[PDB]
A paper describes a structure:
Specifically, we examine the influence of epistasis on the evolution of a well-characterized RBS-directed bnAb, CH65, which binds and neutralizes diverse H1 strains. The affinity-matured CH65 has 18 mutations throughout the light (VL) and heavy (VH) variable regions, which improve affinity to strains that circulated early in the donor’s life and confer affinity to antigenically drifted strains. This work showed that CH65 primarily matures by preconfiguring the HCDR3 loop into its binding conformation, thereby minimizing the conformational entropic cost of binding.
To determine whether the mutations Y35N and H35N could stabilize a binding-compatible HCDR3 conformation, we determined X-ray crystal structures of unbound Fabs containing Y35N in the UCA background or Y35N and H35N in the I-2 background and compared them to previously determined structures. Although the UCA with the Y35N mutation confers affinity to MA90-G189E, the HCDR3 is not in the binding conformation and has exceedingly high B factors (bottom left). Although the loss of the aromatic moiety from tyrosine to asparagine likely has a destabilizing effect, we attribute the observed changes in affinity to the loss of hydrogen bonding between LFWR2 and HCDR3; this is in part because the lineage member CH67, which has similarly broad reactivity, acquires a Y35F mutation upon affinity maturation that is only a removal of a hydroxyl group, preventing the ability to form hydrogen bonding interactions through the side chain.
Numbering used by the authors:
A (entry chain L): 1 to 212
B (entry chain H): 1 to 227
Amino acid sequence: QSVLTQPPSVSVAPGQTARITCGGNNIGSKSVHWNQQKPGQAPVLVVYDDSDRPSGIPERFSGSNSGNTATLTISRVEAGDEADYYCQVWDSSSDHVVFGGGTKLTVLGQPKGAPSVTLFPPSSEELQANKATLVCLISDFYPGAVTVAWKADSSPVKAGVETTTPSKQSNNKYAASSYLSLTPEQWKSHRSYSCQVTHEGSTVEKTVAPTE
Amino acid sequence: QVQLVQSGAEVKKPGASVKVSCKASGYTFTGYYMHWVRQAPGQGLEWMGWINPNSGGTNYAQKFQGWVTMTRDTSISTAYMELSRLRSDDTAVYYCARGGLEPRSVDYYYYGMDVWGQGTTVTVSSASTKGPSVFPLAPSSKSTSGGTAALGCLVKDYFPEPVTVSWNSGALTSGVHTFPAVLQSSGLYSLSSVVTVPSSSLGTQTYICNVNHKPSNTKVDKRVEPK
């Protein structure tokens, strides 16, 4: 009924003011509450009744609500404010809580970095169990988007690849990994295999060879 | 000290059922609605319904009618939620959250969801429990750069999460990078843990990764030796 529409992403430089909008038909007549959810954690109520704060929440968090748009406003944005923000209303037709879809706040300015790439061949233990796995570990990149491609002797390999989505490291850069499954005969029949990581238009490629 | 404490992670087959619990402390349990909200991985919050712990009356969002049952036991200030006939896309973290104050009264005040439980993961998968095959990732000249060598452990084809890895029983902690697991299309996970160490220290020092897969009651200490 009340379908709350939030922008999927908002980005803001440190110290600036972030505004996250929550659009709805005559949302101005309802009380809007806002939850903050940091990666890995349960949500936390940061603003209720459009503009009030629970005790403990810093005064930098405020909201407005007028007409067809409620707005969560975060002043003097710190990097610790990176989080998903959700708005919430109570529908009167059916005692039903409606959430908006959430807005990712990314705080700009973190240093970019190209990925480091480490490639391991199948272990002899694995080969002796009649299997083979190539492991490609990718770390310290930022921003956290990467593409991974595999080659056997420069031709592209597309079966048997499993790649993670990137995730934040404790140093705020990202890590990912990619696995290539093949048979021991496939591993030994080629001169080399390569894991090729593309990040922001540039590539880092590591090679391993069965006879090395 | 207002707290909601939910029961632990659950792993189920499609078609199974599960009953999760939410224990409230630090306030009068029967004075507030209890809500339940779920969040499928990487997705947004989805309200499921509320229960009135004073009367037992409930109210479910449309798509949760017919397979979600919210109950409570006021004796122990505990809300329960039973999910019947799980589907793979019910995989999600399930939260309880305290809601509107003073149910059905002049003082009724819904100021949001001011307190949330820590969440209960419910994973629904046709994969079956399976301990990992642990393989050494041997430090070679190709795993060495600038006098430091990388060596590690491949923890292959296990289910469900989680697995923990330590090194040399907890004594080796600097230089350890344990990567998040990949979920393969077989439904099984794999992860790797790698440690960077002095290449002069190979030959004098033993490296052992300690893998614990509690869901399968399996532990593996795997020695990692040079080529």
